[PDB]
């Protein structure tokens, strides 16, 4: 069994991106007798694309777990459906700002995740991890990312499963905002890495 | 030096407090030479002046920090001051909604913590935790405590330093609130215990 | 030319809901040479779309918009996508929960609104309107009658547009809110009134 | 019997301050016998001091209610206390940022409200108008001229009441906030200014 876990370079002015250190800390590691490969992406349309088909092609991982940061969320979310569109309120970091376009022209207008989210869900409340299912990834990158995977799991046959995760910032990432007049919502990093395990070890169960 | 932090019991519904828990884990440490007392209060309005008085007369503190519990914040908030009044939102922990009514009859209408709040909150930023100055702690019975204690060192001469400060819900908090539809904001409990050992280290400091 | 505009009876314990009162005012009239019939739509999954299919069966309008009320949100807010779920946080007027399940099965997993969304939004602005592209409309009500509105157009030809439009509490309707602690935003009935007004125009002009 | 209403002039980057409107709506009009005056003043601390003062000692009002804006408030907020401390977040419209300095060293460090604020919040209420008692009105200017004038109070005899008023955005101020990706709350200009009256309303028949 193969896993793989992508996450977010930093981008709209944030120094970091929690994800880009989830998918680093799990890169390489096994859980049981799976291996988990960690990829990072740029959070730049077209480029995403590319390195995201080459690491699918390349792996061919039996489960895709794509995670991103989510500005001012307060809990882990776990993303219901990807949209066929891409309508962006920011530029890229490569300083494009795409709207109204579809990701696939002709390929359906959705895709629901593959991921046992409710299954993941109830087993980060059991470990005390606040959780819930999101219904809107946006229509940046993230969605981006997810959707072009669960147009390849449905094109290629795998990965077998594929969804996406957001997590909130983490608690030093709040610190220079203070400043700026308002304090968004935090979860400390190990929560945020912890969850994303958790979502893998339930796939994997969850997964023949 | 001596050192009280109080904390308060569960209220409102709510299973649990972390701030009992703070209260419970800091009673007995030693920083440095100084000793610590952690004292958990009633939400109770009489009551908790009751055992508040009596711990500050027993204890005779150098530096008093109230803990208390904040639904709803996002970070670590210190207290910039305390109003002598009274209106409860909801009833306490024995059905009583006292509505505006003061706190001490003829006393300063408030009184501004005498803890060094800008130096703790600065450290706290160093230490990686979200954090804020608060310029109110409500009318219930957070802000009750605070005044009296505040009251108290006016009057008798000690403790030197008295404040409060408000927490975050802690994760295991919110697992249960995400069926009433809603997420509130949360902090580990681990860095909302080491928040207040923070603050307790910078109050030691700036005293003398 | 026809239009379909509809509204809910009121739901959650809310003794009244906007949006009936904007069907009801505005069923009827004419805009310019164009009929509106404005029909109110019970909050019961089932018989909701009985009344819906029976009355876009009867009229067959060329635009549908359908309007519900949105709890919490401060502006008007155009629904980009109906999904083909049923995912309820409270039961409908009749008591019941449905979770997890299509709204028509094997049908698309969503459709996009056919109202012309950015037009809207920019009349709106230019009208002194607050208001903002959604990108979902939840898995309650307001989402299965957009969903069911969008699948009836795309098997059976008409009407050409159809889409949501969510409106936040009108003030009268947060009075009694601020004594349960809490504040949620608002927006004048006669705003959210002409809000729907301008989606029409709008819709009639982009409409041939 | 006389009133002094005043409002402020655009701060913040904000093109306007509803207000200001307010205030020379105001200007002029007659309540029964009462005179009312209204009055804009600056955004900037030193010269809003000497507008407030010159003010005072000029019309010598029976009642003084200042009113100011509160970005993201969703209702009509009674100011209870102002405190005797300027913590400024953002600079004045003269580019000064005061922070922890008293505004009348040696003065009381807060003062109550001598508005009956329950009795207005009462009669907004049964006007259907959002409203609450705000237990802080910042550290900026809103508090500094509310501090000020209660402060003149005190120490003159007049005028006999005293308090602030907090005013959400109006609609038309939330347009260009949409586009930087925000859409905070809002309340009519109309009901704004209806809430003030009403509070003048009450203030006379409290008044003796």
Redesign the interface.
Known sequence: MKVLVTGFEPFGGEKINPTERIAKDLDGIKIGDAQVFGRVLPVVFGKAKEVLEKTLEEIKPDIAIHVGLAPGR??ISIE??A?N?I?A??PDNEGKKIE?EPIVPGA?????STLPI?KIMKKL?ER??????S??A??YLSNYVMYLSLHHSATKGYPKMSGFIHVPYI??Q??DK?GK?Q??????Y??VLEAVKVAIEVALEELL
């Open positions: 307060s809990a219901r459906i949209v569109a309508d309120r920011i109204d359906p207008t959705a895709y629901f409710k409340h005390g991890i606040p959780a819930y299912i219904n809107s946006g229509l608690p030093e709040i610190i203070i007049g304090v968004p919502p935090s979860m400390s190990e929560m």
